[PDB]
Nucleic acid binder design. Structure first.
Ligand SMILES: [Mg+2]
Ligand SMILES: [Mg+2]
Ligand SMILES: [Mg+2]
Ligand SMILES: [Mg+2]
Ligand SMILES: [Mg+2]
Ligand SMILES: [Mg+2]
Ligand SMILES: [Mg+2]
Ligand SMILES: [Mg+2]
Ligand SMILES: [Mg+2]
Ligand SMILES: [Mg+2]
Ligand SMILES: [Mg+2]
Ligand SMILES: [Mg+2]
Ligand SMILES: [Mg+2]
Lengths: 148, 130, 34, 118, 176, 77, 138
RNA sequence: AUUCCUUGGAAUAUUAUAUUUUAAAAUAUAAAUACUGAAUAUCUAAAUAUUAUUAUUACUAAUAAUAAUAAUAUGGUAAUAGAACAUUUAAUGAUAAUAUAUAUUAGUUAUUAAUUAAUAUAUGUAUUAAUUAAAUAGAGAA
RNA sequence: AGUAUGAAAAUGAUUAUUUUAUAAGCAAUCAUGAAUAUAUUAUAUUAUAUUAAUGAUGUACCUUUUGUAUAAUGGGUCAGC
């Protein structure tokens, strides 16, 4: 009974926004949180046989919080098939190369379920080191929130 | 039909409503969603006309919430206000669509109104004509 | 002559910030090149 | 307990529990109980004497067996039929004998005929 | 009004991380009594009595006095969407009969010079209104039709299909 | 248009070096075809295709995708 | 404008009146044939009469055919169960008959975990929406 | 939740909600049983066997068949014990082309089997149902 | 190596339905959308059948072994014996 009705809004992909400048969660935690959103576990209509997750826009990713000495010491790895071609890059190095966004993305990828849907979900997450971005318009926004 | 007729014939005097009861048990017990029967041309106009007929401020569609503009599948929520009383919520992938939906919803509300048995038999002023 | 647009508080109040220099940017690469 | 807004609504749902199994129904639904009833036959009617929750779109009465005085929810038994037959094959990993474990459990089908406030 | 306690559809588990899990909801049990649970849902296709506005109920129905088609949103804040200029600034009936006649004559004479927009500009009035008033020369209409047909023909396969789909969607979106 | 094997292929032995033995087989086939007409059959199939296309439900953005899964006898909303 | 798009009503067997699902039962047997001995005994034994007395809305045909003994039963929906009661005894035959009577004609079918209710009524509460949730997500 | 006394009660605090009062303050209510987690246990039905109680049906009736209630038991290699089915032959043996046999598809009966319906091919038609007797009596394993 | 008959399988070509060109492992089972086919009670918001969206679970079988996914034995498939 309950499942019957117009279900179009449930399975609508919302765009969420997280300002990492105004969020005090440290990297990993934040990533984990994002993962849930991506999967769509937050919504009661979720079923594992279905990608129903929302879009997440992360902005000001340069101000992400990383604890301890991880910025210097935390090493990301990449291997071709060819022996001797192990690349090991420190987080800072990676940031310099690509950006904090990349870091965040990696974490999210790690978090996510390892199946076909993964890649799509990952791509749903849009990250920007600084503030500006092309999705400003499409973040979910209510009419009552317009006091500011 | 004949069976019903026969029933009526036998119970015309001893229990007049018996036939009706039987019919209800059999014919009227069957599910029909009345919501699935409608199909509107341009409902906004109709809604406006209805408002005019009644004692209502002119209906205006307004954006309540919006997400995913600039995307394959956005969501726009528009209500059709009459002053303050919201007359019909309407969701849509486009603004236009949302507006249309709101109007349709309003129309449905107007029509499919189902009053209680404790109320005094309500009689409508027919159908809206435009 | 306005259009029905809304805006999130989270995105309005977000202080402006410039994105730093990515090494894999074309501009940066240009500088590097010989 | 002021039960007026349930009284006034046209759509109404109930969450009755048979042997603690909760089923959430409106009137006209068909509840498939996963067992054979011996008390009721076909055509009999059951008045539900355990209803956890009655609900409208926006209000909901709740309680551990809420008074039978407040509502009338009665279901008629339509069918006693079994769910389809299956032979799940049981065996170990280097042993030629197999134990065919057959399964054709039984169902009782109800129809929620009345669901109203009293 | 009613002074009932209000609640969310609660789960004993974490809602953020496990909202789809039925078991949690089942596990949760609340103190016997009445409750107010606002529907976590739009009322678009619905015909529920607790969905109908007070203005559409008869002046007698007890539900009028009760408070459960809640006016949560406020019309002051919500932007006007896809509205005509006559709604923002009230309708005008300034235009007389002679003027109308003249307009009609003009339309009959030269549609490309005196198009609807032009007419509107001239007489401070809506194109729709102009259309309502006056039919153009049928030849013009025919020409327009022909043009449209040509355009349609010029379409590729995919585009036609897309158009059809769009039409279908449109049709659907008045069902509710 | 298709190929069947025809009847009785004759197997021959083919002696190889050392004591090794192949068995050569001489295959014979038959080609069968069915020719239909562009006037009727093709037209009919085109019509069918068109009908199918017409039937096809449109891609809706907020399409009522059924809430897959069992309910549980409990409202999550 | 309002245009009507046609539809038809769906029958809910038990909501108003209740039509009894089983309508006819045909006890089929054979004079010659040891497999049909139990059936014959059943036919003899006033049990049939008793059954008839109990359940008058359902009619009992009694055919004579050369093969194995049967209980073909005909239901409202149209479908027909048929049980060959080869070599059964009286009591077993009776049990079979009972089973036939109890069932609605509907075809057998695998149920999933917890698929209990089957409605054609739109949800009383709406289908959840992210925008009309009590709690926004973040 | 925290503290005290002896599963409980009390206080304190927190959260949530409702109502009143001027985003606060007061009043009442609820929550404090953490949760997940097995083919474990219970419940919920079904089968079989045994023990002990029944009920119905039929002239070792202290029996049999079926159905209840309570209980206990039901993983399994080597192995022991008990009970069935398929196939073929012999004894007995109605019946019938609206019948049968075999095949395909969809049903039905707790289903290696049989039966129902439709379809196709035979065939003036069962070594047919059933009880016995027997076996060149069942094959992915050499 | 009798004569008829032969929709028995393995095996080949072809056509239809369906799935399939960002996806990785006994190819099944369970969940679960979608598409197609049939149905003289689909009254439908119907029922079955077919089908590698998608998700979860899932080391072939025998033999011999203290013990086998084993990279230990044995088997190309089917029919007959
Ligand atoms: Mg072993
Ligand atoms: Mg095995
Ligand atoms: Mg979890
Ligand atoms: Mg040949
Ligand atoms: Mg050579
Ligand atoms: Mg060769
Ligand atoms: Mg157990
Ligand atoms: Mg055992
Ligand atoms: Mg042998
Ligand atoms: Mg063999
Ligand atoms: Mg075998
Ligand atoms: Mg192992
Ligand atoms: Mg080998």
């Amino acid at each position: 009974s309950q499942k019957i009705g117009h279900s179009g809004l449930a399975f609508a992909r919302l765009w969420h926004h997280v300002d990492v400048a105004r969020d005090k969660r440290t990297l990993g935690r934040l990533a984990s949180a994002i993962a849930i959103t991506l999967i769509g576990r937050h919504k009661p209509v979720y079923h594992p046989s279905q990608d129903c997750g929302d879009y997440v826009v992360v902005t000001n990713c340069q101000k992400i919080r990383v604890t301890g000495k991880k910025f210097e010491q935390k090493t990301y790895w990449s291997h071709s098939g060819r022996p001797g071609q192990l690349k090991l890059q420190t987080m800072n190095k990676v940031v310099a190369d690509k950006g904090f966004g990349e870091i965040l993305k990696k974490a999210v990828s790690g978090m996510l379920p390892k199946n076909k849907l993964r890649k799509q979900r990952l791509d749903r997450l849009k990250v920007f080191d600084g503030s500006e971005n092309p999705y400003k318009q499409n973040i979910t926004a209510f009419a009552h929130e317009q006091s500011s | 039909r004949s069976i019903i007729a026969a029933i009526w014939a036998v119970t015309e005097q001893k229990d007049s409503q018996a036939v009706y009861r039987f019919i209800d048990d059999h014919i009227m017990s069957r599910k029909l969603d009345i919501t699935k029967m409608f199909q509107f041309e341009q409902p906004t106009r109709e809604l406006a006309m209805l408002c005019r007929r009644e004692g209502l401020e002119k209906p205006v569609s307004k954006l309540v919430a919006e997400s995913g503009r600039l995307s394959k599948s956005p969501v726009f929520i528009v209500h059709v206000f009459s002053g303050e009383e919201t007359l019909g919520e309407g969701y849509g992938s486009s603004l236009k669509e949302a507006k249309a939906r709101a109007a349709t919803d309003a129309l449905m509300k107007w029509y499919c109104y189902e009053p209680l048995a404790q109320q005094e038999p309500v009689i409508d002023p027919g159908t809206v004509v435009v | 002559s306005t259009r029905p647009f809304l805006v999130a508080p989270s995105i309005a109040n977000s202080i402006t910030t410039e994105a730093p220099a990515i090494n894999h940017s074309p501009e940066l690469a240009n500088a590097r090149k010989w | 307990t002021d039960t007026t807004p349930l009284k006034l609504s046209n759509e109404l749902y109930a969450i009755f529990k048979i042997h603690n199994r909760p089923y959430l129904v409106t009137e006209g639904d068909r509840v498939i109980l996963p067992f054979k009833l011996k008390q009721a036959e076909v055509g009999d009617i059951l008045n539900m004497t355990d209803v956890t929750t009655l609900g409208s779109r926006n209000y909901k009465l709740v309680g551990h067996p809420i008074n039978t005085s407040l509502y009338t929810l009665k279901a008629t038994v339509v069918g006693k039929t079994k769910r389809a037959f299956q032979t799940r094959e049981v065996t170990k990993r280097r042993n030629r004998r197999v134990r065919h474990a057959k399964s054709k459990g039984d169902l009782t089908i109800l129809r929620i005929s009345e669901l109203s406030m009293n | 009004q009613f002074g009932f306690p209000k609640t969310q559809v609660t789960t004993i588990y974490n809602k953020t991380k496990s909202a789809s899990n039925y078991k949690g909801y089942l596990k949760h049990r609340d103190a016997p009594g009445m409750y107010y649970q606002p529907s976590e849902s739009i009322a678009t296709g619905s015909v529920n009595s607790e969905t109908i506005p007070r203005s559409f109920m008869a002046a007698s129905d007890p539900r009028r006095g009760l408070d459960m088609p809640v006016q949560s949103t406020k019309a002051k804040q919500c932007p006007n969407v896809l509205v005509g200029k006559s709604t923002v600034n009230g309708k005008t009936y300034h235009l007389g009969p002679q003027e109308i006649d003249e307009i009609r004559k003009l339309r009959l004479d030269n549609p490309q010079k005196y198009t609807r927009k032009f007419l509107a500009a001239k007489y401070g009035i809506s194109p729709l209104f102009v259309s309502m008033v006056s039919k153009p020369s049928e030849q013009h209409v025919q020409i327009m039709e022909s043009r449209l047909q040509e355009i349609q023909s010029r379409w590729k396969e995919k585009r036609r299909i897309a158009r059809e789909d769009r039409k279908r969607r449109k049709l659907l979106w008045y069902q509710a | 248009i298709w190929t069947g094997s025809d009847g009785f292929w004759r197997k021959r032995v083919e002696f190889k070096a050392r004591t090794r033995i192949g068995i050569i087989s001489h295959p014979y086939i038959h080609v069968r075809c069915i020719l239909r007409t562009k006037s009727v059959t093709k037209r009919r199939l085109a019509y069918e295709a068109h009908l199918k296309e017409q039937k096809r439900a449109p891609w809706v953005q907020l399409g009522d995708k059924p809430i897959r899964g069992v309910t549980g006898g409990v409202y999550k909303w | 404008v309002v245009k009507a798009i046609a539809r038809n009503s769906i029958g809910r067997n038990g909501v108003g009146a209740f039509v009894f699902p089983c309508r006819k039962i045909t006890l089929q047997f054979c004079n010659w044939g040891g497999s049909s001995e139990g059936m014959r005994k059943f036919l003899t034994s006033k049990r049939l009469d008793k059954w008839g007395q109990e359940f008058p809305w359902i009619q009992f045909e009694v055919m004579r055919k050369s093969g194995h003994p049967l209980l073909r039963a005909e239901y409202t929906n149209g479908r027909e169960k048929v049980i060959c009661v080869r070599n059964l005894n009286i009591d077993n035959v009776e049990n079979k008959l009972k089973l036939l009577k109890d069932s609605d004609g509907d075809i057998l079918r695998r149920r999933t975990k917890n698929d209990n209710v089957e409605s054609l009524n739109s949800s009383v509460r709406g289908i959840w929406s992210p925008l009309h949730a009590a709690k926004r997500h973040r």
